[PDB]
Amino acid sequence: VTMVVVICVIVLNIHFRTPSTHVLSEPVKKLFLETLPEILH
């Protein structure tokens, strides 16, 4: 449960990122939007 809370904190950090605070890297975007959505399913 401690590990899941840490995971939830990280996922909320990922969710609430904005252009004015972070830069969406193209390798990161391509990995998490094209590869892993296909792999998981």
Partner 1 sequence: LIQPSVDPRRREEVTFYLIIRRKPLFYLVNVIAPCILITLLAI
- Where do contacts with partner 1 occur on this chain (CB under 8 A)? 2, 5-6
Give least dist CB 21 to partner 1, A.
21
Reading the block at residue 18, the tokens are: 């904005």
Of the candidates 34, 41, 39, 32, the one whose C-alpha atom is nearest the C-alpha of residue 24 is 32
Q: Which is nearer to partner 1, 12 or 33 (CB)?
A: 12
Give least dist CB 22 to partner 1, A.
21
Of the candidates 13, 14, 12, 6, the one whose C-alpha atom is nearest the C-alpha of residue 31 is 14
Give least dist CB 2 to partner 1, A.
4
